[PDB]
Amino acid sequence: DGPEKNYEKTLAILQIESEKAELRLKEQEVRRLMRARGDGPWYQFPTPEKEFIDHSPKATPDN
Amino acid sequence: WDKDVYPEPPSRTPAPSPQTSLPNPITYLTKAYDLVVDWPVTLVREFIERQHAKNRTYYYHRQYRRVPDITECKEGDVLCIYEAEMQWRRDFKVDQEIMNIIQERLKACQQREGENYQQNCAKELEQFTKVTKAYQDRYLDLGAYYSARKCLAKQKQRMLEERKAARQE
């Protein structure tokens, strides 16, 4: 075919793998921040359920 | 072939100037060699030349156009760095072939001047030493993993040394 094919295919492969590197490191820092502080969707550890509390009138006022 | 790249002084030969009334076996053997070997061989090559000229074909050189060098390239951009390293490696191979050409010139001059060579073969000698020193200040103390970045670091260290030198009044 020629040299242009190899050259430009190499360029494509290079941008692909560079972007992958970028995203892997980004994922590392993202997981770090999400775990150190639960601001994000991940590492949101469970809490007690709210809907199983009874809010009705009790037997004593100062419940 | 191209006598500006590969120069050759003209082969000035003295006239025979014989003294004997006797024969030289060189010349008559040359006549025989010519009319035996050179004539059919020239016939064959003329045949082959005209058969080339029947169906002539051409080829080209692939001029490679310049590209943003690595000094105009960002740390991390692998595409620009790839293109720059490629054009550097291209220039590198070309520089080796230049050095080969100049060494060839030097050897041919040494042979034609022969015995009296260390007075009239100094032109090619200096033309070899200069380009040698260039190669040495350009490609020498690298290793197998030479690259544009390594040559650039070398150049930069050397320019720093030169700046520190010319600092002195």
Curated annotation (Swiss-Prot), chain A:
Name of the gene: Ndufb5
Subcellular location: Mitochondrion inner membrane
Whole-protein coverage range: 127 to 189 of 189
Family per similarity comment: Belongs to the complex I NDUFB5 subunit family.
Quaternary structure note: Complex I is composed of 45 different subunits.
Organism whose genome encodes this protein: Mus musculus (Mouse)
Protein name per Swiss-Prot or TrEMBL: NADH dehydrogenase [ubiquinone] 1 beta subcomplex subunit 5, mitochondrial
Function: Accessory subunit of the mitochondrial membrane respiratory chain NADH dehydrogenase (Complex I), that is believed not to be involved in catalysis. Complex I functions in the transfer of electrons from NADH to the respiratory chain. The immediate electron acceptor for the enzyme is believed to be ubiquinone.
Swiss-Prot record, chain B:
Keyword entries, A-Z: Electron transport, Membrane, Mitochondrion, Mitochondrion inner membrane, Phosphoprotein, Respiratory chain, Transport
InterPro entries in the cross-refs: NADH_UbQ_OxRdtase_su10 (IPR019377), NDUFB10 (IPR039993)
Region of interest: Disordered: 1-23
Coarse class of the protein's main subcellular location: mitochondrion
Any Pfam family hit: NDUFB10
Family: Belongs to the complex I NDUFB10 subunit family.
Name of the molecule in the record: NADH dehydrogenase [ubiquinone] 1 beta subcomplex subunit 10
